[PDB]
Design a protein around this ligand. Structure first.
Ligand SMILES: CC1=C(/C=C/C(C)=C/C=C/C(C)=C/C=C/C=C(C)/C=C/C=C(C)/C=C/C2=C(C)C(=O)CCC2(C)C)C(C)(C)CCC1
Length: 300
């Protein structure tokens, strides 16, 4: 007999208002053809109004592949960027799938810079998207920047073909709760003390990133934290705590800022924790919350 499994833990606070327009838009994007995809991504990225810094984040992992692409003629450069978006089995697509999330993003950032400088073949002057791609572009363009950044990240991480400094903890407050395991988690994540944060989990515990599967076990969670969590700033604001079957479930809402955009952009999140009777994190889900505008729209 078990009171909770990882699977059943995923459904805690089931009426959380998740921004399902994000994966909805990604699914629509994945129905478009390679050329429409690349041109759409160029317009999203360039028209977002957000300055992207690589500086606060990595690139040494991508440099050999980047040099390769830089040396290719324009015809081959564009084909490579089509293999990536189309998920074609190629050496470069397999190498890309081994990059960490932030390495993938740095990869694409450098190509974006080279396209501006005419070192990498640009999107053709005036290339006209299909009507369908034009509808996907406009839905992306309407989203708040932080949600567009999430769309892009999700698309970038899924391209290709699949075959640092610790601060001391500083005090943080969350109105409405007094849970030390939650506060330890948030403060250790802000300090980039990822071994300390992971130590709060049960050995069989999981962390569920937004719109992704649970990452199970401390070794895996730590690797993920190394890959994706450096330079994040977590700004939990408020919470509720409820006892359930001798466990505690805690929902916290607030924001994160990514080092890609600094303090110019804040993404609205929920964190959904299930703690065991000993105060260990059995499960935590992070969700991107729907805006008031998106809730309205996805009714009426
Ligand atoms: C492709 C492509 C191009 C270039 C694209 C470029 C350049 C894109 C750059 C995009 C970037 C830079 C996006 C960055 C997004 C970052 C996000 C969205 C981060 C969100 C993080 C969150 C939400 C983390 C929350 C979490 C919390 C709070 C926890 O407690 C646990 C850990 C974790 C779950 C991590 C060009 C133009 C050439 C055209 C051709 C195709």
């Amino acid at each position: 007999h078990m009171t909770f499994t990882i699977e059943s833990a995923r459904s805690i606070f089931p009426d959380t208002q998740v921004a399902n327009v994000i994966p909805a838009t990604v699914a629509s994007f994945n129905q478009l053809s390679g050329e429409d995809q690349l041109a759409l991504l160029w317009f999203v990225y360039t028209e977002m109004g957000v300055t992207i810094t690589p500086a606060a984040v990595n690139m040494i992992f991508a440099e050999k592949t980047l040099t390769q692409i830089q040396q290719m003629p324009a015809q081959e450069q564009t084909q490579v960027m089509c293999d990536l978006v189309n998920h074609t089995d190629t050496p470069i697509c397999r190498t890309y799938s081994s990059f960490g999330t932030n390495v993938k993003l740095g990869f694409w950032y450098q190509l974006s810079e080279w396209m501006k400088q005419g070192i990498v073949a640009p999107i053709p002057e005036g290339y006209q998207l299909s009507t369908k791609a034009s509808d996907v572009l406009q839905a992306i363009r309407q989203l708040e920047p932080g949600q567009q950044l999430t769309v892009l990240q999700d698309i970038v991480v899924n391209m290709g073909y699949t075959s640092q400094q610790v601060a001391p903890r500083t005090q943080i407050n969350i109105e409405g709760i007094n849970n030390e395991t939650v506060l330890s988690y948030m403060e250790n994540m802000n300090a980039f003390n990822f071994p300390a944060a992971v130590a709060l989990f049960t050995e069989d515990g999981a962390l569920q990133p937004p719109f992704q599967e649970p990452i199970v076990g401390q070794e895996s969670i730590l690797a993920y934290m190394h890959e994706e969590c450096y330079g994040l700033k977590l700004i939990p604001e408020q919470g509720i705590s409820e006892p359930v079957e001798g466990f505690t479930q805690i929902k916290v809402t607030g924001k994160v800022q990514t080092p890609w955009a600094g303090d110019s952009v804040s993404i609205n999140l929920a964190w959904r924790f299930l703690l065991n009777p000993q105060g260990k994190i059995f499960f935590v889900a992070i969700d991107v919350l729907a805006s008031p505008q998106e809730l309205l729209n996805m009714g009426f």
